[PDB]
Design a protein around this ligand. Structure first.
Ligand SMILES: Nc1nc2c(ncn2[C@@H]2O[C@H](COP(=O)(O)OP(=O)(O)OP(=O)(O)O)[C@@H](O)[C@H]2O)c(=O)[nH]1
Ligand SMILES: Nc1ncnc2c1ncn2[C@@H]1O[C@H](COP(=O)(O)OP(=O)(O)CP(=O)(O)O)[C@@H](O)[C@H]1O
Ligand SMILES: Nc1nc2c(ncn2[C@@H]2O[C@H](COP(=O)(O)OP(=O)(O)O)[C@@H](O)[C@H]2O)c(=O)[nH]1
Ligand SMILES: [Ca+2]
Ligand SMILES: [Ca+2]
Ligand SMILES: [Ca+2]
Ligand SMILES: [Cl-]
Ligand SMILES: [Mg+2]
Ligand SMILES: [Mg+2]
Ligand SMILES: [Mg+2]
Ligand SMILES: [Mg+2]
Ligand SMILES: [Mg+2]
Lengths: 54, 353, 442, 425
């Protein structure tokens, strides 16, 4: 059971004890995704307004 | 009204428990995938322990201990004994065992197995060993045939000293093993069912042909088919405790309790107390109980040897009624009370030192 | 000194943030009006507490924090309440109508219209930083904003601050306090899209906190206020190393280095002790051995699961109060021989330990008694995957019938995103299993 | 998500609508003159969901009153709270609709509808963030049913991204005005299936049975029926009207209650059942009663189907712990009746302010597949007549064709089939 890297200061201390050793999309792409979702909403809304028009 | 779900249709023990719970009129059975249950009678494989104990307003209990497979797997059990300090390599009641992976798989102990196999080549000592996997058995004093047979198969096997000097029932000059049923409840009380059974061989033992495996394997399956005297001495091949006891009193001037059961109780408690910290559900968000079947051999000096532990045992036909009732009594109603002379012996021992 | 910016998203993230900053102020002796007597360098500095607070020439210490919610009622209470003076108006950002417990509405529909404003507000804070380390992001899994807007924000943060670290504090859904049937959907969706953008995420299951409150604070029916005060103690334990003098986890990068060897498996389990009721008339103070032992009790974990049936990749113990190394090491020795603690083969069996001598600060009039010593253990154990399995099962149940799916498609999300997210989770569960488990009528 | 715009149409819609406003005005401390006189500030915290503020801190219902004849709106204006409504929000014609859906939807109502949308628009424009609309009407007459569904279509066209919510009174031969009620209701249901997000099904069959069997009213009047309805309406809108976490606006409610777009017809329930008693009711009693078929306002047996989703609301001062305990108890003990493929499908709210006259109350809103019983009933009444084309001249005379009848019937039978499908899934 070995203690290592013991560091002390006024506010406390730290160390390690070992018991045993080892046995991104760009802005462009994001905007496209947000715009495609928006267009899908727009299309569904247009379909509804067409149905209501009939 | 308590609720439960059945997820192992092929279990005789729990099919009977299920029936009894219904008959109390205070237990209702849900569809196997309804999660609003008090009690899960689980499946044998990949029981989803991770989904238990997250149902507000329900105390949840399950009929298996997560981790118990350590005891109940040939290879696991060997490892557990040899590497657990409280069991140790100095364990006098477990036959010398080694774990051996096939060559197609290649940790393994083949190396160390031969080391002791030699001292028995040299030693002149009985150098017969049995090999088995968790069908698929070979008994021989030639290691070459053992290791060979293992490599022919695809899964992990274990090589274990064959007990060449077993106790033999007379008349018959015949082998047998002892099965004992043990119920461990949610509190980790250990309960030994007071009735065990001897699965007997109906053929006379013989230590010259270890390939004639009908007088060497006491399994009730291998006896009902491959054996021509199935049922001659008992029905079959099953001798119970009252009789085996009378026999021990008449033939050997001893009792079942003194010559054998003390050792059995010691072994059961030692195995289960070993794994308790790894499987106990004491402070867990769901609780567990389990029925185990321990299988023992007895040598001619009346010494007991643990063969294996079964995590999902059946019971002897005439014993289901009582055992199963006992399970709902101590494992189920204990947690979920309904609106003696126990059939169980509580295994407990507090030696001070 | 390197700055950290905190980002609170949605109701859960905002209310938790409220509670953490209250506690920080108490710990650092910062008054509600933002003044800090004990701080002698007026109008600036590079003390450790400056990691979380900036300074004005008037001596005001201002959280490096942004609050974002798609509706105003929760943040309005920050604008109006005890610490109103702490926060600059530009730091408190609200929309008009919320995400209605719908990830797709939080991510695509409303996210698109507010995301640029949020970033520009974060940039303002970043501009005040000499050496920004990165971000700490507080949100629920189950809410529409917490799930959907956060994942959008995290993607854009990787784009605008590609080298900066990103840590999460995530609230995982529990039915006892949840507000929506679809929280499992929102959880998987957000985990899927955030996964590659988060370096280390501390999941808190409301079920666990709820029960700790009932059991150990004797609260009959915990509220968010009870929950968040407890959660804020655990969050303070975790971030104390960033805010005080010390040598362990002193910057965000060190969290990954110490707790996350495999980048997808970045969800350490937090376990905290002791939790004692302030109403408890007579209380015996618990030792180093006792509170250390309690770290291996599922009952004290932030997520109920069983570490005995998994493996460890890393373990850090963070103590506050009267603790010296020798007692920690004696406690560990004893615990090692009484418990199931298995590490993966390719890691050392060991503990990194931090001690700060100041015992936990509690809120005047709160539910928590003050104690002489406490500890937070952060362990990267495969057992936390139990939580993913629970979630993935609820998801599978509903999705097989497409229940509620139309709410999401109606927001412009494609159904296909459900199965991709689910498939990512399935891979995640499998990874944990490979790291965690060995291959295993009679 | 703040303002709701309320519309009440026809005789039934306006009579139940008036009562609603009387009841919640009372809860919020608002007097007939629009002056606030309450004691608790919980009353005013979310008052703007239903009321506009005028000068003198007068509060004015965001309510629009519609009818094709003046009679019932004259009554409303003379009623208890009649002066609280905005005078310009009374929109009425002179001709009536003769219990005829075609007159409401295509002829008499088409002439009036633009003036209604004019008032709807004026109300919507002064909303900081309109969440949507609530309409009270019956399905059995002409104006509420025919013109009410016309308005819904036009509102949707002008505000397609807002929530549309109705309290719809379903006809019963037991409490009936004319024989054409099944026609008017079938034609109306078709509209609702497509153009509302949430519909509380209020079955006059059930209201009558409750008054008769439970409240011991030998001769129930519409007034007695409407007592139950206003109590239910106050109940189901509690979460919208007071501070709270769960189902606090129309969109979150729909997201919690509607797994499939067309299955948005709810069975409301109320406890305790009261009529115009000092019995303290215990949390266990409220809970048992709120789930009791006899407390349900749609005449369907909940044991004949399964609950897809449930919202429960408890009001009064009581133990949150006991509330949670009791709700869990009902689910755990009757778990077969809640579909297993929507986990945790029951949600519970509590509000400290109870309704007038009671210390404790509970309101139940269920999305049960047993609601198909209501639509089957209407479907059988419709077919009995339609197979002989009986009474159809009243409709073909307003320009409608039989085909439209065939289509509305097919669509309602389809809806029945969709409930049966999830009852067996
Ligand atoms: N611990 C804790 N959980 C919270 C709190 N507020 C909400 N939650 C949980 O978070 C989930 C709901 O998400 P919210 O944060 O309320 O939703 P939101 O991010 O505001 O998203 P929308 O309201 O849909 O726009 C549920 O699981 C709640 O139990 C809180 O203050 N503390
Ligand atoms: N090491 C050993 N020495 C002597 N006999 C042994 C032995 N190991 C096994 N046997 C014999 O082999 C039989 C056991 O087979 P085995 O241990 O593989 O059980 P099994 O897995 O085939 C069925 P079950 O799980 O129901 O007991 C016993 O009946 C016994 O007769
Ligand atoms: N509950 C209730 N039902 C009503 C009331 N008035 C009429 N009804 C029912 O509503 C239907 C008739 O529609 P009605 O509103 O009178 O006609 P409209 O003016 O053309 O909309 C019938 O089913 C009546 O039973 C009322 O005040 N309360
Ligand atoms: Ca300073
Ligand atoms: Ca990154
Ligand atoms: Ca005219
Ligand atoms: Cl960068
Ligand atoms: Mg055996
Ligand atoms: Mg076996
Ligand atoms: Mg919100
Ligand atoms: Mg009428
Ligand atoms: Mg006009």
């Amino acid at each position: 059971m070995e203690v290592i890297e013991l560091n002390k200061c006024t506010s406390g201390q730290s160390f390690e004890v070992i018991l045993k050793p080892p046995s991104d999309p760009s802005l462009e792409e994001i905007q496209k995704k947000l715009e495609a979702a928006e267009e899908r909403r727009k299309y569904q809304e247009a379909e509804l307004l067409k149905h209501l028009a009939e | 009204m308590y609720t439960f779900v059945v997820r192992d249709e092929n279990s005789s023990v729990y099919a009977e428990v299920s029936r009894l719970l219904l008959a109390t009129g205070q237990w209702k059975r849900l569809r196997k995938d309804n999660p609003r249950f008090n009690l899960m009678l689980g499946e044998r494989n990949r029981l989803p322990f991770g989904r238990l104990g997250h149902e507000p307003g329900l105390v949840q209990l399950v009929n298996y201990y997560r981790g118990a497979d350590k005891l109940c797997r040939k290879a696991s059990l060997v490892k557990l004994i040899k590497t657990s300090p409280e069991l140790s390599e100095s364990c006098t009641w477990f036959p010398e065992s080694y774990v051996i992976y096939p060559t197609n798989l290649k940790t393994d102990e083949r190396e160390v197995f031969l080391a002791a196999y030699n001292r028995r080549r040299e030693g002149r000592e009985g150098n017969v060993w049995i090999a088995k996997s968790s069908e698929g058995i070979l008994i021989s004093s030639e290691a070459s045939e053992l290791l060979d047979f293992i490599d022919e198969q695809g899964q992990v096997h274990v090589i274990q000293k064959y007990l060449e000097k077993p106790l033999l029932l007379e008349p018959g000059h015949r082998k047998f093993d002892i099965r004992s049923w043990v119920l461990v409840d949610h509190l980790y009380n250990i309960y030994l069912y007071r009735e065990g059974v001897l699965r007997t061989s109906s053929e006379p033992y013989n230590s010259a042909n270890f390939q004639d495996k009908t007088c060497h394997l006491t399994n009730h399956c291998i006896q009902k088919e491959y054996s021509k005297n199935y049922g001659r001495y008992e029905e079959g091949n099953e001798m119970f405790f009252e009789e085996f006891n009378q026999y021990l009193m008449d033939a050997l001037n001893t009792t079942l309790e003194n010559s054998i059961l003390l050792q059995i109780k010691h072994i059961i408690r030692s195995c289960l107390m070993c794994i308790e910290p790894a499987i106990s559900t004491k402070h867990l968000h769901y609780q567990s109980f389990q029925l185990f079947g321990f299988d023992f051999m007895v040598d001619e000096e009346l010494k007991v040897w643990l063969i294996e532990v079964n995590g999902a045992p059946a019971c002897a036909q005439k014993l289901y009624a009582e055992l199963c009732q006992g399970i709902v009594d101590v494992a189920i109603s204990s947690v979920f009370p309904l609106a003696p002379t126990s059939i169980f012996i509580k295994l407990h021992h507090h030696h001070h030192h | 000194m390197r700055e950290c910016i905190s980002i609170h998203v949605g109701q859960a993230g905002v209310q938790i943030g409220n509670a953490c900053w209250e506690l920080y102020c108490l710990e650092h002796g910062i008054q509600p009006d933002g003044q800090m007597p004990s701080d002698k360098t007026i109008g600036g500095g590079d003390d450790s507490f400056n990691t979380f607070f900036s300074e004005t020439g008037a001596g005001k210490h201002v959280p490096r924090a942004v609050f974002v919610d798609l509706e105003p009622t929760v943040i309005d209470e920050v604008r109006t309440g005890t610490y109103r003076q702490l926060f600059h108006p530009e730091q408190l950002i609200t929309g008009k109508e919320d995400a209605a417990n719908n990830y797709a509405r939080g991510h695509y529909t409303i996210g698109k219209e507010i995301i640029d404003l949020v970033l520009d507000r974060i940039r303002k804070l970043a501009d005040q930083c000499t050496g920004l380390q990165g971000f700490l992001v507080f949100h629920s899994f189950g809410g529409g904003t917490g799930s959907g807007f956060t994942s959008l924000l995290m993607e854009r943060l990787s784009v605008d601050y590609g080298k900066k670290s990103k840590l999460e504090f995530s609230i995982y859904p529990a039915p006892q306090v949840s507000t929506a049937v679809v929280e499992p959907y929102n959880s998987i969706l957000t985990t899927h899209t955030t996964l590659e953008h988060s370096d280390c995420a501390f999941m808190v299951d409301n079920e666990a906190i709820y029960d700790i409150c009932r059991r150990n604070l004797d609260i009959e029916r915990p509220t968010y206020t009870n929950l968040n005060r407890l959660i804020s103690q655990i969050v303070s334990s975790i971030t104390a190393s960033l805010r005080f003098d010390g040598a362990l986890n002193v910057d965000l990068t060190e969290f990954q280095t110490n707790l996350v060897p495999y980048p997808r498996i970045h969800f350490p389990l937090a376990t905290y002790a002791p939790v004692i009721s302030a109403e408890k008339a007579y209380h015996e103070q618990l030792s180093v051995a006792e509170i250390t032992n309690a770290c291996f009790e599922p009952a004290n974990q932030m997520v109920k699961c069983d570490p005995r049936h998994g493996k460890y990749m890393a373990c850090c113990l963070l103590y506050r109060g009267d603790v010296v190394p020798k007692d920690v090491n004696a406690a560990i020795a004893t615990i090692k021989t009484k418990r199931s603690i298995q590490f993966v083969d390719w890691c050392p069996t060991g503990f990194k330990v931090g001690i700060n001598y100041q015992p936990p600060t509690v809120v005047p009039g709160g539910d928590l008694a003050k104690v002489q010593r406490a500890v937070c253990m952060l362990s990267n154990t495969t057992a936390i995957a139990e939580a993913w399995a629970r979630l993935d099962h609820k998801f599978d149940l509903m999705y097989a019938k497409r229940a509620f799916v139309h709410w999401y498609v109606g927001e412009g999300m494609e159904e296909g995103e459900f199965s991709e997210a689910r498939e990512d989770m399935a891979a995640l569960e499998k990874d944990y299993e490979e790291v965690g488990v060995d291959s295993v009528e009679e | 998500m703040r303002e709701i715009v309320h519309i009440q149409a026809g005789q039934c819609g306006n009579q139940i609508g008036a009562k609603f406003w009387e009841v919640i005005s009372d809860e919020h401390g608002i007097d007939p003159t629009g002056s606030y006189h309450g004691d608790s500030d919980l009353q005013l915290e979310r008052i703007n969901v239903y009321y506009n503020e005028a000068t003198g801190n007068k509060y004015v219902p965001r309510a629009i009153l519609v009818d094709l004849e003046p009679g019932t709106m004259d009554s409303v204006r003379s009623g208890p709270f009649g002066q609280i409504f905005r005078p310009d929000n009374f929109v009425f014609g002179q001709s009536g609709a003769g219990n005829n859906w075609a007159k409401g939807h295509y002829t008499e109502g088409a002439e009036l509808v633009d003036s209604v949308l004019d008032v709807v628009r004026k109300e919507s424009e002064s909303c900081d963030c309109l969440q949507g609309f609530q309409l009270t009407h019956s399905l059995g007459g002409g104006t509420g049913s025919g013109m009410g569904t016309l308005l819904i279509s036009k509102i949707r066209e002008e505000y397609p991204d807002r929530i549309m919510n109705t309290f719809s009174v379903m006809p019963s031969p037991k409490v009936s005005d004319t024989v054409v009620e099944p026609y008017n209701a079938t034609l109306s249901v078709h509209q609702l299936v497509e153009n509302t997000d949430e519909t509380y099904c209020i079955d006059n069959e059930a209201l009558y049975d409750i008054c008769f069997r439970t409240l011991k009213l030998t001769t129930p009047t519409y007034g007695d029926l409407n007592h139950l309805v206003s109590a239910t309406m106050s109940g189901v809108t509690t979460c919208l009207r007071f501070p709270g976490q769960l189902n606090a606006d129309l969109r979150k409610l729909a997201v919690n209650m509607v797994p499939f777009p067309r299955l948005h017809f709810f069975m409301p329930g109320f406890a305790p059942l009261t009529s115009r008693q000092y019995r303290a009711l215990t949390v266990p009693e409220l809970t048992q009663q709120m789930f009791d078929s006899k407390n349900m306002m749609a005449a369907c047996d909940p044991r004949h189907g399964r609950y897809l989703t449930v919202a429960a609301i408890f009001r009064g001062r009581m133990s949150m712990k006991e509330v949670d305990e009791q709700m869990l108890n009902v689910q755990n003990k009757n778990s077969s009746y809640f579909v297993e493929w929507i986990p945790n499908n029951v949600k519970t709210a509590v509000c400290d302010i109870p309704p007038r006259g009671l210390k404790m109350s509970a309101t139940f809103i269920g999305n049960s597949t047993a609601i198909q019983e209501l639509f089957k009933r209407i479907s059988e009444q419709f077919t009995a007549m339609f197979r002989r084309k009986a009474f159809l001249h009243w409709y073909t005379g307003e320009g409608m064709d039989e085909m439209e009848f065939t289509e509305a019937e097919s669509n309602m039978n389809d809806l029945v089939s969709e409930y049966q499908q999830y009852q067996d899934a």
